[PDB]
Amino acid sequence: HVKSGLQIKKNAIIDDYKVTSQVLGLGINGKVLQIFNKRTQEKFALKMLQDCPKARREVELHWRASQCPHIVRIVDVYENLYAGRKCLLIVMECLDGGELFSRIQDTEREASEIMKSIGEAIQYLHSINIAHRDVKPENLLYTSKRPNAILKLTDFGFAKETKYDKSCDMWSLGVIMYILLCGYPPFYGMKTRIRMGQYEFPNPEWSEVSEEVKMLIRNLLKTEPTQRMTITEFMNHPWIMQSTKVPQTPLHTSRVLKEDKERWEDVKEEMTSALATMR
Ligand SMILES: C=NC(=O)c1cc2ccc(-c3cc(Nc4ccnc(N)n4)ccc3O)cc2s1
């Protein structure tokens, strides 16, 4: 029950990790990086922030959430002086496995087992009154390249300690589900179609998909936030709850995600701004 509180180290991060000026210079510009622990040799991830209230918020929330088996663990946080400018250097577990959809790009039950995982990340956050507000393809990473890797939620730049915010996380869940089951997002102006909730479940991709499953997506994508299901109701849905009573039925996802790649950069982009719009 009792876990340690957050301790910001003030020694030069380069005492503890191999990091170079080149791999530091790319950091101040948002990118997260490959670093190595000197004592153990293990691989970790570095993310660099300029110290400021926003950065302190992120670190704080992320530390609080690290506990979850389904959220990237903060391992250390440093407060250093970089080129005469205060910085927060965040050290994280390394996620070799790449982004959720990049994997698939290589089964209904597999789709469900994934959503249950993203589901736990959200339940944990919501239990401790945090809303993530940027749950999307590139914040879902697999620990390693093994078939059995754990999928983890990352990036708390927009997380917010509290509901409208929470329902934003549920909407993402709907969108990630839709794509998982077919390989393309819903709402196929864009802004208008989202406002209007204008999506469908096209054959062929959706012909042998349970009405129960569609109803589920339908609840998550509700245009009126107070109408969406909550994480608890999501997590108690049969499709999610018993992820091993769900039919091994094949999905067009992997093929579609392969042919229709090149659009992938555009859907990552649309979803990022949809999210930006609901914040
Ligand atoms: C495939 N070549 C490699 O050898 C790897 C390079 C990287 C680079 C980064 C990460 C990694 C990335 C993130 N990403 C972000 C981005 C933004 N915010 C947050 N909190 N995390 C979070 C945790 C991570 O381990 C894993 C690897 S594996």
Q: Which of 23, 132, 134, 141 for mutating ligand 1's site (highest number of atoms within 8 Å of CB)? A: 141
**Widest distance between CA atoms in the chain:** 60
With beta carbons less than 8 A apart as the criterion, state whether 104 and 254 touch.
yes
Residue 209 Cβ < 6 Å to ligand 1: no
Would the annotation count 30 as a binding residue? yes
With beta carbons less than 8 A apart as the criterion, state whether 90 and 46 touch.
yes
Name the residue at shortest CA distance from atom 20 of ligand 1: 155
Query: What's the CA gap between 134 and 171, in Å, rounded?
Result: 10
Q: Which residues contact 189 (CB under 8 A, 6 or more apart)?
A: none
Which amino acid, 156?
Answer: F
Residue 108 Cβ < 6 Å to ligand 1: no
Would the annotation count 139 as a binding residue? no
Q: What is the DSSP letter of 99?
A: B
Q: Which spans in the chain are helix H?
A: 21-25, 53-65, 100-104, 108-127, 164-182, 190-196, 211-220, 231-235, 238-241, 253-259, 264-278
Nearest-atom number in ligand 1 for the CA of 72 is 23
Q: Return the domain boundaries, the chain.
A: 13-94, 95-279
With beta carbons less than 8 A apart as the criterion, state whether 99 and 118 touch.
no
Kindly provide the resolution of this structure in angstroms, with one decimal: 2.9
The length of the chain is: 279
Which amino acid, 131?
Answer: A
C-alpha to C-alpha distances, 194 to 147, 191, 224, 260, nearest whole angstrom: 34, 5, 11, 21
Nearest-atom number in ligand 1 for the CA of 45 is 25
Helix, strand, coil in percent for the chain, rounding step 5: 45, 15, 40
Residues with a known catalytic role: 134
Residue 95 Cβ < 6 Å to ligand 1: yes
Tokens 């380069």 — which residue?
A: 14
State the CATH architecture for 13-94.
Answer: 2-Layer Sandwich (3.30)
Name the residue at shortest CA distance from atom 3 of ligand 1: 96
C-alpha to C-alpha distances, 45 to 11, 26, 72, nearest whole angstrom: 18, 13, 10
- Residue 99 Cα to ligand 1 middle (Å): 10
State the CATH architecture for 95-279.
Answer: Orthogonal Bundle (1.10)
If one counts every other C-beta atom within 10 angstroms of the C-beta of residue 200, the result is 10
Nearest-atom number in ligand 1 for the CA of 32 is 9
With beta carbons less than 8 A apart as the criterion, state whether 66 and 77 touch.
no
Taking the CA atoms of residue 198, residue 201, residue 202 and residue 207 in that order, the dihedral angle to the nearest 10 degrees is -170
With H, G, I as helix, E, B as strand and everything else as coil, classify residue 1.
coil
Query: What's the CA gap between 60 and 80, in Å, rounded?
Result: 17
Closest listed residue to residue 250, CA positions, set 104, 106, 107: 107
